[PDB]
């Protein structure tokens, strides 16, 4: 199964705070 | 004086091979194993040792064996060292008196395994017609140690051939105790699982192989994802062949599982292999990609969010939802615009830089093509996310909203040609093109539509010749309704044009009418 969620993920174009 | 010579060099070799050939050792020997085997259960470790060492120094090598065995099952005749090991290392445990009193003799057993092969090292394995003394001893001595039952010694034996490297050793062992050893070493070490899987291949148990290989891939063991892939793979082939006993619904329920795995393997594998690649993500991030993509298979949620649809890798995207069998008309065909667009636009870039490029860059159409193809080609051509109802009009309007024709040198039904030679079938893509032709939506509005009768022309004509061939005569009246209907619009965009091109139409035309007799 698949679930879309745009909400909360993590910035693919910047490394970690 | 060499027939004296000869007598003198056999009783010499009969001097050698007398301590063998006789009859009271034989029978002394064979009497002190006897007197200790009664006093197994209370032999002190310094004697037991320095019995094997003399049984030894006499080649009593199986003899040895047995006593050593013997006084393994008599110092603890309950079987508790099956109970210890078999339930797994209790630690803070009286049962390490048992397995510990029991592995002082099977040490010893290794001494002699260990020093019959140095003794008879190299040593020939048949005599002119008969098998060697030393081949008999070992013989002998290899018959004590497979047929024995006290198989904590097998398992504590079996360490021992893998910690020695004797690999095509456990293999060859047809006793049915080492396959409980494996199994519970399987589970928690890569090198052990490997053995697993080659001892039930060569008994061609294909099944109990992928049965494995497959809940190896799902495993928590650190083992790399492309090597998953491998196991995957090669279970997908050992679940694919019929094995003596197992049913049809079993071994595809198998077969399943495995193909399902491989297919978001493969999506995981391919985008982690873009994702590094990339010039666009910082070279921080990706360290921490790879070490989470890198490894187990994870979920279709994972590889989507935080990374196929971030990046808008739409051709990724779209191979997640087929193999998530995602329903959703719209967003399925949002993203192939995308797709096609993105596409496009690179393709325009390589050849703008060309004008770094390498060899000539490929013109936008063709790049945007190989792009279907490759999703065409790896899912199967699905009614789902390649729903041709959508997609075609789509391709067929950007081959005109961007110019892909004959302007730049590109055949004018480059996306006909696209759909066709990729399996659609022909009575398919017309009853798409008739669907374009009437309702003359944008851009397939005005003169224009003069090149939807050209994709109507070859899509029929590509018809009609595999019909000829194919041995037929579904093809009916409306395709010559819509190819008569057709030839309305050449005639009102030749008024119209009232353009240059007043001759080509005229030509199409000759071609309409032509094909609409083959069909009549």
């Given at each position: 199964?698949?679930?879309?969620?745009?909400?909360?993920?993590?910035?693919?174009?910047?490394?970690?705070? | 004086?060499?027939?004296?010579?000869?007598?003198?060099?056999?009783?010499?070799?009969?001097?050698?091979?007398?301590?063998?050939?006789?009859?009271?050792?034989?029978?002394?020997?064979?009497?002190?194993?006897?007197?200790?085997?009664?006093?197994?259960?209370?032999?002190?470790?310094?004697?037991?040792?320095?019995?094997?060492?003399?049984?030894?120094?006499?080649?009593?090598?199986?003899?040895?064996?047995?006593?050593?065995?013997?006084?393994?099952?008599?110092?603890?005749?309950?079987?508790?060292?099956?109970?210890?090991?078999?339930?797994?290392?209790?630690?803070?445990?009286?049962?390490?008196?048992?397995?510990?009193?029991?592995?002082?003799?099977?040490?010893?057993?290794?001494?002699?395994?260990?020093?019959?092969?140095?003794?008879?090292?190299?040593?020939?394995?048949?005599?002119?017609?008969?098998?060697?003394?030393?081949?008999?001893?070992?013989?002998?001595?290899?018959?004590?140690?497979?047929?024995?039952?006290?198989?904590?010694?097998?398992?504590?034996?079996?360490?021992?051939?893998?910690?020695?490297?004797?690999?095509?050793?456990?293999?060859?062992?047809?006793?049915?105790?080492?396959?409980?050893?494996?199994?519970?070493?399987?589970?928690?070490?890569?090198?052990?699982?490997?053995?697993?899987?080659?001892?039930?291949?060569?008994?061609?148990?294909?099944?109990?192989?992928?049965?494995?290989?497959?809940?190896?891939?799902?495993?928590?063991?650190?083992?790399?994802?492309?090597?998953?892939?491998?196991?995957?793979?090669?279970?997908?082939?050992?679940?694919?062949?019929?094995?003596?006993?197992?049913?049809?619904?079993?071994?595809?329920?198998?077969?399943?599982?495995?193909?399902?795995?491989?297919?978001?393997?493969?999506?995981?594998?391919?985008?982690?292999?873009?994702?590094?690649?990339?010039?666009?993500?910082?070279?921080?991030?990706?360290?921490?990609?790879?070490?989470?993509?890198?490894?187990?298979?994870?979920?279709?949620?994972?590889?989507?969010?935080?990374?196929?649809?971030?990046?808008?890798?739409?051709?990724?995207?779209?191979?997640?939802?087929?193999?998530?069998?995602?329903?959703?008309?719209?967003?399925?065909?949002?993203?192939?615009?995308?797709?096609?667009?993105?596409?496009?636009?690179?393709?325009?870039?390589?050849?703008?830089?060309?004008?770094?490029?390498?060899?000539?860059?490929?013109?936008?159409?063709?790049?945007?093509?190989?792009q279907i193809q490759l999703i065409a080609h790896r899912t199967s051509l699905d009614s789902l996310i390649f729903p041709v109802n959508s997609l075609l009009?789509?391709?067929?309007?950007?081959?005109?909203?961007?110019?892909?024709?004959?302007?730049?040198?590109?055949?004018?039904?480059?996306?006909?040609?696209?759909?066709?030679?990729?399996?659609?079938?022909?009575?398919?893509?017309?009853?798409?093109?008739?669907?374009?032709?009437?309702?003359?939506?944008?851009?397939?509005?005005?003169?224009?539509?003069?090149?939807?009768?050209?994709?109507?022309?070859?899509?029929?004509?590509?018809?009609?010749?595999?019909?000829?061939?194919?041995?037929?005569?579904?093809?009916?009246?409306?395709?010559?309704?819509?190819?008569?209907?057709?030839?309305?619009?050449?005639?009102?965009?030749?008024?119209?044009?009232?353009?240059?091109?007043?001759?080509?139409?005229?030509?199409?035309?000759?071609?309409?009418?032509?094909?609409?007799?083959?069909?009549?």
């Amino acid at each position: 199964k698949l679930v879309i969620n745009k909400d909360m993920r993590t910035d693919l174009f910047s490394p970690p705070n | 004086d060499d027939v004296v010579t000869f007598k003198a060099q056999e009783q010499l070799q009969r001097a050698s091979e007398q301590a063998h050939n006789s009859p009271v050792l034989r029978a002394l020997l064979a009497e002190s194993l006897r007197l200790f085997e009664q006093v197994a259960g209370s032999l002190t470790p310094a004697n037991l040792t320095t019995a094997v060492e003399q049984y030894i120094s006499l080649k009593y090598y199986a003899g040895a064996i047995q006593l050593c065995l013997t006084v393994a099952q008599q110092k603890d005749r309950g079987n508790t060292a099956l109970s210890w090991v078999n339930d797994g290392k209790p630690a803070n445990d009286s049962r390490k008196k048992a397995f510990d009193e029991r592995k002082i003799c099977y040490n010893l057993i290794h001494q002699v395994l260990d020093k019959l092969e140095s003794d008879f090292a190299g040593e020939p394995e048949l005599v002119d017609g008969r098998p060697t003394l030393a081949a008999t001893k070992r013989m002998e001595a290899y018959n004590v140690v497979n047929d024995s039952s006290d198989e904590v010694f097998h398992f504590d034996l079996y360490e021992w051939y893998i910690e020695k490297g004797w690999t095509d050793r456990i293999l060859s062992i047809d006793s049915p105790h080492v396959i409980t050893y494996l199994q519970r070493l399987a589970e928690t070490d890569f090198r052990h699982a490997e053995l697993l899987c080659r001892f039930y291949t060569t008994r061609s148990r294909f099944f109990e192989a992928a049965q494995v290989q497959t809940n190896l891939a799902k495993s928590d063991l650190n083992i790399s994802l492309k090597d998953r892939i491998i196991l995957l793979s090669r279970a997908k082939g050992n679940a694919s062949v019929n094995t003596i006993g197992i049913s049809r619904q079993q071994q595809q329920q198998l077969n399943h599982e495995a193909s399902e795995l491989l297919e978001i393997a493969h999506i995981q594998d391919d985008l982690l292999e873009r994702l590094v690649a990339d010039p666009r993500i910082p070279e921080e991030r990706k360290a921490e990609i790879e070490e989470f993509l890198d490894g187990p298979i994870r979920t279709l949620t994972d590889l989507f969010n935080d990374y196929a649809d971030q990046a808008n890798y739409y051709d990724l995207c779209l191979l997640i939802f087929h193999a998530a069998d995602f329903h959703n008309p719209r967003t399925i065909l949002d993203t192939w615009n995308n797709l096609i667009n993105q596409s496009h636009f690179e393709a325009e870039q390589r050849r703008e830089y060309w004008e770094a490029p390498i060899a000539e860059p490929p013109l936008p159409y063709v790049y945007v093509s190989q792009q279907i193809q490759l999703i065409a080609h790896r899912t199967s051509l699905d009614s789902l996310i390649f729903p041709v109802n959508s997609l075609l009009p789509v391709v067929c309007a950007y081959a005109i909203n961007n110019g892909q024709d004959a302007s730049i040198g590109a055949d004018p039904c480059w996306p006909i040609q696209l759909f066709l030679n990729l399996g659609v079938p022909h009575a398919l893509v017309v009853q798409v093109l008739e669907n374009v032709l009437d309702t003359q939506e944008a851009p397939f509005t005005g003169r224009r539509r003069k090149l939807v009768v050209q994709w109507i022309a070859m899509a029929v004509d590509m018809w009609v010749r595999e019909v000829e061939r194919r041995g037929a005569m579904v093809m009916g009246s409306w395709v010559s309704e819509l190819l008569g209907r057709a030839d309305q619009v050449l005639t009102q965009i030749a008024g119209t044009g009232a353009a240059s091109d007043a001759e080509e139409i005229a030509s199409l035309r000759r071609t309409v009418k032509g094909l609409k007799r083959s069909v009549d």
